[model samples]
Target: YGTHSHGLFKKLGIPGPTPLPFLGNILSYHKGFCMFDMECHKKYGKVWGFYDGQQPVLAITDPDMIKTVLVKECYSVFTNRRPFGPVGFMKSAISIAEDEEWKRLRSLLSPTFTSGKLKEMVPIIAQYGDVLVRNLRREAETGKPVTLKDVFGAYSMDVITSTSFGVNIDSLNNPQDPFVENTKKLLRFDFLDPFFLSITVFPFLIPILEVLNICVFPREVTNFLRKSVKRMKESRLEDFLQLMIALSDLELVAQSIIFIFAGYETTSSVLSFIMYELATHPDVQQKLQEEIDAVLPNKAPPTYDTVLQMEYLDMVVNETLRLFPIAMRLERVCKKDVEINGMFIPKGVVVMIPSYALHRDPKYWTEPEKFLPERFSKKNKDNIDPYIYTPFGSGPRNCIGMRFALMNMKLALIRVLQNFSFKPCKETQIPLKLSLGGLLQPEKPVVLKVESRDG
Candidate 1:
């Protein structure tokens, strides 16, 4: 090793695996498929050292440490996401920007995701969920196995389009929409891995890579989003898009792409996981359905008011988010020096709070692996630490679109359960393995049989 850099190691005061040449511990992390990170946590404990290619990375798994890093020391130790890949038109995206620029952009865009503003989009969200139910029902009639990911992808696309752009492309009904196709391409961008790997290895090379046409977003998608934002700005109809328009034109373009980019894949992935979990845990599924039936007794679709009142359904969603957060890890850069657990951390060191790992830690959870929605109930919640279960993250930088995301997910699940009973197909894999290339996804299509539940 490099002569025991006690100065740097002493400053952090965290114990972890030793770094290997240029790759560090990335090879170990990149090798496994299921709960790999958790396995490391088991061996290494909560706070440990690691490296992402030569750069020192501190993995903090304790809930209190996570809270301090994300909230209390947000400015000092957790400022913004570390730069990654060829962001292209997304350079001005909120997650990557820092300091005054982040504050300004976050403030300007905050109104669009407010509870009141999101309330107006419920009808629109429910409309797409309705389409999802109808589409699945048609598949059920034909005795076709529905791929939950594809269904949720279409469902998520429809919701984001309606709420963000105020345009109804109806990918749920018409799967062939060009916009949907472009969205799929954007979500499955092939260059993202290499670009992100490059960022981790040599962040300073990002600009050069972008200049060389190495982009995570396809040109067509970027152009379409830019045009959409420009159209909305010109129309000035006072909608969520107005928030994008309020920023600089480039920021608006970046925000538009990021809005679609962030929403579509993660929502789809979470919904797919929920579907898989429900399929596997039939008792839990029955309990959830009973709650839905009791809440909306007439067999009619759920209204915004009625849906909001379904306490059990809220618990189910929270449990699902706890188990399978779309953005599993949150990374932040230190803006200045700070102390954590009696150790002084120098400015510029990267800290990672692994939400996936923390949610399943046995120290903080009872049977942490079980699908127990009751854990989030009022009585149970009072017994647990709030920092232990943060799927949307914590503090000021938490997801602005949380309300929108929850509504869309809940509406989709309600509609699905109301129309059909889901069971895992023969093709379904046990102990789901997240897809390696894309954002966390079940390794194979979550095949489920959707039998009609019409009374």
Candidate 2:
């Protein structure tokens, strides 16, 4: 391994902090690691390399280099998503799965996320949004300070459960549902820290550990999801679940869980951040509300077609994504040895693209630090490079569920805005510090005084 480090150093010309034996640079990202990679980029420039023990990771920030790795050179080497724990077997779906299996699963699942299928799910999506509004109104009537994260979680869970499993869990109403409980447990299954460390240090041990069933999904969650899939298959629902059933059984479990887990937290966090931003910037909030009212007068809730038509709403969502992308970083592995920005990348090495850094780069955006949605207007859109603003990612492997996720967000916001207006409470952090462990949550609760719009 020591000799391999020397070889890697010679192969990749750029330099970074020295790796400590088995630990590599893992300690640098232990907890509260924010924009550390940005610091690295500042010191080392766009093309640089670092070590995670013997594993050589090449980091790229240049737009053309990002295009080459994510699009042009995707086949030979692609993004490697490190699974959370032993239950990492579920990582074999299109997003994380490697080689031929990924191709097959991606092909089978493509139709489910097509524009037509998403449009079909819109009524179901709007139904969930209406439920969220009713729930919030109930809370408001009781004079309770709503935990936006928890509420959004419930709303997102219901949307994914209905869309993916063909069952209406209605987690927003029945927060104690066994399915919801297990799903939460599955998502919170970062209990095995040692296993993650072991995988990072000794990659070969993952399969052995997985085989021993040392890394099993929570039995309750696994059984619930499995049974859910079986029920969907038997009932022959005309929805996304049918697509999962058409694929491999294991895949049905994998894809269903992915949609449920991925959909719930990301959309929830994005909405939470959007609310926070709106709370801070009342002017932006007014502009957004005016646009919503003009498009759908009489306080009509957003529909699939209407939501798509609201251009300014789209800009707000896009701008929020730019400021606080839930997935802060993207990584791809070199498939074939490629030359990028005068640096030679070896096949199999991980390439990191810190979207957080790219989005804030002044070279690509004007007043990048400010929360400005007008920059995304159609006329101004041409001024910025498309690659720099990939909240859903770019190219073929871009988030497959982008449309579904966006519709869910837009509809939720439309209802949320109609009933309530947000003003940041005293506890709300000024700069919005992100949570340590979870996917980019505000460090403090966004305690907003939601006054009834009519009142």
TM for every model, in the order presented, reads: 0.91, 0.92
- Model 2: per-residue Cα lDDT over 1-455, one tens digit each: 54256357554467776677776776766553346667776878776777765678777777888887777666666644544345565667566677677767777788878898888888988888778887787766766566787888888888877777666766885656657777666563232255555566676776787777665556667777777677756667455776544466777778777777678777887898888888878898888888888888858867789889887778889999988876777777666677866767766677878787788887788788888898889788668876778787887678989988898899999888876888865566577777665256676766666767884
Supply candidate 1's per-residue lDDT for 398. Answer: 87
Clashing pairs in model 1?
A: none
Candidate 2 stretches greater than 4 Å from native: 1-7, 31-33, 79-88, 173-175, 188-195, 244-246
List model 1 lDDT by residue over 80-191, tens digit each: 7776677665667887678777888888888777777777768778788778877787788888777877788888888877777777776875746656777776674422
For candidate 1, the per-residue lDDT at 95 reads 73
Query: Which portions of model 1 show Cα errors greater than 4 Å?
Result: 1-7, 10-12, 32-36, 173-175, 188-195, 235-239, 243-246, 436-438
- Candidate 2: residue 359 lDDT (0-100): 87
lDDT of each: 0.73, 0.74
